[PDB]
Symmetry: D2
Subunit: 352 residues, 4 copies
């Protein structure tokens, strides 16, 4: 009944809450491994989605089922499961339109640490267990598995939105844990040249590991003119935004060729307007499609990504640089996300 | 020959130029019916695509072939043809990528009054007659046929970009001649409710004629607040932008539901940045796809829209509010586009 | 209660069954109007999908909600509803893949008169009311509304699967009620020339009403020869199959041009294989895509087709050639579908 | 000029022909490396596309440009180039419709050893050199590069047509060179499990090399049965057909789940019809899309596959099991393609 929660905007700390009870279709899960996200920094310290009061944080968890509702059919207590960060209500009009990420409202499929208590507690509540849980194979280590709920689905969704054709040249703007899975996702969509944009040397090494053929550091100059030289004025076929300020939107439109695609998965927390360059967008007519999506969730998304991990299509363990232990280290791993060490990509806290 | 040209930014007038000469694959066409476009106002008086010097204007024309190159197979002198605004070079890498509008560079398939002398002349040059001309059936009048090169393909391209599903609710921002064709295109994509946004009474009558079920005038208040009341907070499935300043882009994102599409065909002439509202775009994750395209051209595009007029799927003659006559009246119709009268939609100058 | 049921393969009759009770998410409906389907002839007399025992027939119904479950939120007793022919279980993996029509197994989204008691009873059961019912606007009469559950969604799905481009030439093979809605559907996707294939004058008249520009009589001569002559050897951009024997598949492949689409919504009830002509399929390489699909259902599909009726995009009332009053005439209307007289398109029974 | 030609159906031999001259847009190329194809066996010995007289065989070649026309702007004599098997005329309506493979008619984008003298001569003619040749980087050896013109673009086209989603389970029916590249192609689309169906031990090794996770031998029982056991009766998300008689079409339909795709790239050379099984295709309604395509060609396609080789995304040299050198050994390699020894995958003849 203890959990690390967001007291208000700019203030965090442990609180005490009632242990959640499952509905007939729900499950209660105790976490075996969790991970903090930059998104919890964007909501706490930037108030990007408004004010909260005593909301448990955290949304990336592999856990063990301890209680199921009278209608749960595919999960028993004791089952080890990968919980997706997006756990929608599956009976809404948006699902019938094909957008479960927005089931019941904009971004409403994202429930943990948004409009529902997160996984940073001795237990948490997963709604619609048969639809929003996936069994964890015994062959996948806990550290790699906890990268599936959020980092892998978001990074891969960026590659999916980019509509990569075989052999296409892809740029990945941002090589944090999300952008690194975007680099992997691009390679899984059969990209040829993958140009990664970042600075931290631990991120640059992992980007090459996941298939980046070129590294672009802003120290050499503006990223726009730097990538344009790599492409001899042609540009990239797609640019995946996985970090940066609102101005990175303008950088993306400038480096993508006409007919190319700008695929955003970045959570912009500050700024009122995301700039789109009029001239580099063809004054409205360059066919530079812009996409920006919340990562898919639910049981099928996790099962699909479990197979990709299982059959060795992507190894997410290289995202995990720091492994803590014990509930108390949740606060420390969370604070590592506010001020990132230079040797950090993604921390993981193991609990049992 | 003589032709109405853009002397410099902000100055137009008639000039003297040699009659153009065709290559083995090209044709020389004399115009039978022409029409001016708002796009030529954006370039002349706003300098939206840079400076020009003595460039004949005009890109909407129905003509008669007067000379063909030794390699033209399908067109003879004396053929009456619909000339598209977009006449790309068809042997480029962009065409192999599937974006003929950008063959040779951004917007480079748009040649007339962009990088080439336009149709406001005694003759004009059409590159690759076999690929960029369509035969005009005797059953379609000159006034209806001259709407096909630019207005119809652009409006229909807005509806194509919008990814309309059967029964979807569509908003069209701007009900000038392009937006009027976007209301028609929306209906031809099977839209249910079509909410048109405009004020001019002549345009509103035409909007209803082409399918609009609701008329939104800014007089009642903000367009965003007005459309949200019409849809009980849900919004529209797609929004076609066919006019307005750079702020209309923000309006379209605010009124489109998550997972919807913003389809822009407006030529933005002023401002550096098209604003995209961070919050109403889901902070980057609302799956509100943004598109913006130059209208398709070439022979096949024209033949397909010719069939749409022939089989009575759309009557573009209702766009034509003014019918001038004589080469001299081209200057009259062009300035008539800088300050649109309240009873104007689209003017047409008949020549022979 | 009373109900018109499939006793066994080849025999139908009135039986006695228990009035269904709703689960927490379900509703009980009494029908106000019903219609019989050719699909129930395939099931009973051809045994097309196997034996059945005491299954009430029928899957096209508009009704009145009489009872709802404790969890039903959007529908109360007294509400007049349009009931889709397809009412899937929405919490399955197939829904997460995007194929609700096969929720639980192939064709399993189709419940009425497949794996569940149909609507030809004093009451029927609708699983998951909030997801599988739509409100009926008072402006839409009963006869028209009952064309929405199955005829309109199936025929429109043919047009959806055909991937119709603006101005394309489309052929519709079979112009019973489903094919007539495929003609209308092709019009709602922007088809130019629509070539309808059939012989019965009542259907030919309706096909012209719904937009057919050409009528091909299959008893007049070979369909393939006739359509090639009409298209000057080019073929059509798409052929929608809405009737005929297995060899209509070969006819469709033979008339579609390379890169075109064959879109089947016909329920084939006899024969081991459907033939694809090797040579006219380009020996496997002609890019003639073949689709075949169960019509969409659920609340959203009904609501979108209701808007197409409400805003007068389609008037399905011309499909109704026979209207009867009274429960016992369910038998008469059903045998009408078996006998298929020359003046029949679709019969409706009013129980109001 | 000497050349290995198809004299008539069932007979091949060396003939003498005049050395071709190029049009103003064309190039004459001398082969540095060539490879024979199973498709030529279908053509010569089954007559799958009719009778030919003294047609030089072969459509797989890397060569040196020896002469160009006056309008060729990107290639000079001495340039080493990858020549695609498909070299269409790019100025046709089919290119405008988006299908260069059928430019001028069904399969007409495939010219070499179809409607044009092939690459098995001292020189050959490439039409439209600027559009249909790709520069060959010095880093790619000749034997691997000659897998790009046909094997790689066909197998990858199968993965493209299969509409593969991340993590999906894919079956590849047939693992000769085309099927092995479909295995690599499926991996480049992000497939999870990949079930290869073959029996020759050398092909099984290569299939495991390119990413197969499961091997089904059509000797341990029916393919359909075994694959259903591997998938627990669920089936595969897509099946790529790359070999087999006409019955393989029925096999593919029986193993694909509802909503999945059957993607054929096999050249069927015998049989009047390809059987589609009525029940397992849902009596017409299972949403099992069937595609079948001639492989893409042209400059842009070769360039993108060159990049996938250059950046080490795929290594096609494992396809090459026999390398000879000498013009005369074209006959030797071709006959190996007829009577396929169990250690053969693809032979290559080196000429310089
Ligand atoms: N849509 C979803 O479902 C979803 C899910 C999770 C997270 N997100 C959001 O997506 C973003 C990425 O997640 P994350 O955990 O990987 O954050 P992160 O660790 O902070 O990575 C941000 C990256 O952006 C780089 N960067 C900073 N300024 C840049 C600039 N001008 N140009 C290019 N790159 C620049 C940084 O490079 P260096 O640090 O090396 O200098 C860094 O690598 C976050 O904002 C997150 O909130 C979205
Ligand atoms: N992509 C292409 O291929 C292509 C082709 C041709 C043209 N275009 C461009 O697309 C645009 C449409 O062409 P057009 O000839 O129809 O121009 P137009 O006659 O000036 O029509 C512009 C429409 O926008 C309305 N409008 C003005 N302010 C607005 C606001 N805040 N919000 C919403 N609507 C507002 C106007 O309403 P009222 O006038 O009734 O007050 C008018 O109906 C032009 O800019 C044109 O240059 C693009
Ligand atoms: N996928 C779904 O969800 C769904 C839904 C409902 C129904 N269906 C099925 O789709 C089909 C259409 O239903 P329906 O009520 O419209 O049946 P219908 O009235 O019997 O329509 C049959 C049409 O096919 C014509 N026909 C027969 N042989 C032909 C041939 N060799 N060539 C060309 N046309 C031929 C018939 O000609 P005539 O004009 O002379 O009769 C008629 O026009 C049925 O089989 C039905 O079971 C599928
Ligand atoms: N779409 C295009 O552009 C294109 C391009 C090139 C070629 N093709 C054609 O595609 C096909 C593949 O080419 P290829 O060079 O790879 O020929 P191949 O080596 O003969 O491929 C045959 C493969 O299919 C297997 N096979 C035979 N019958 C089978 C059955 N009932 N079930 C399952 N597998 C069966 C064979 O088994 P074994 O292992 O025992 O031999 C072998 O693995 C050829 O027909 C070719 O002409 C098409
Ligand atoms: Zn996160
Ligand atoms: Zn214009
Ligand atoms: Zn039916
Ligand atoms: Zn081949």
């Amino acid at each position: 009944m203890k959990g690390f929660a967001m007291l208000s905007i700019g203030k965090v700390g442990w609180i005490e809450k009632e242990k959640p009870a499952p509905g007939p279709f729900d499950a209660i899960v105790r976490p075996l491994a969790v991970a903090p996200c930059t998104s919890d920094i964007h909501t706490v310290f930037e108030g990007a989605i408004g004010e909260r009061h005593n909301m448990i944080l955290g949304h990336e968890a592999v856990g063990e089922v301890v209680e199921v509702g009278s209608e749960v059919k595919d999960f028993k207590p004791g089952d080890r499961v990968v919980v997706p960060a997006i756990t929608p209500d599956w009976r809404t009009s948006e699902v019938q339109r094909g957008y479960h990420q927005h089931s019941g409202g904009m971004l409403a499929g994202w429930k943990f640490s948004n409009v529902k208590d997160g996984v940073f507690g001795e237990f948490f509540h997963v709604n619609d267990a048969d639809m929003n849980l996936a069994h964890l194979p015994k062959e996948i280590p806990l550290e790699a598995a906890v990268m599936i709920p959020d980092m892998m689905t978001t990074g891969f969704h960026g590659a999916e939105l980019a509509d990569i054709e075989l052999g296409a040249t892809v740029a990945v703007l941002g090589i944090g844990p999300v952008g690194l899975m975007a680099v992997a996702g691009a390679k899984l969509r059969g990209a040829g040249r993958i140009i990664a944009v970042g600075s931290r040397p631990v991120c640059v090494d992992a980007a090459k590991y996941y298939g980046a053929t070129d590294i672009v550091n802003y120290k050499d100059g503006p990223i726009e003119s730097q990538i344009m030289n790599l492409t001899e004025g042609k540009g990239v076929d797609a640019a995946i935004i996985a970090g940066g300020n609102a101005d990175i939107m303008a950088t993306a439109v400038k480096i993508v060729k006409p007919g190319g695609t700008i695929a955003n998965v970045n959570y912009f927390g500050e700024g009122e307007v995301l700039p789109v360059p009029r001239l580099e967008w063809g004054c409205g007519m360059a066919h530079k499609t812009i996409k920006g999506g919340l990562a898919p969730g639910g049981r099928l998304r996790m099962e699909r990504l479990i197979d990709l991990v299982f059959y060795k299509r992507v190894d997410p363990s290289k995202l995990v640089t720091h492994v803590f232990r014990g509930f108390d280290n949740i606060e420390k791993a969370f604070m590592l996300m506010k001020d990132k060490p230079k040797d950090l990509i993604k921390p993981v806290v193991i609990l049992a």
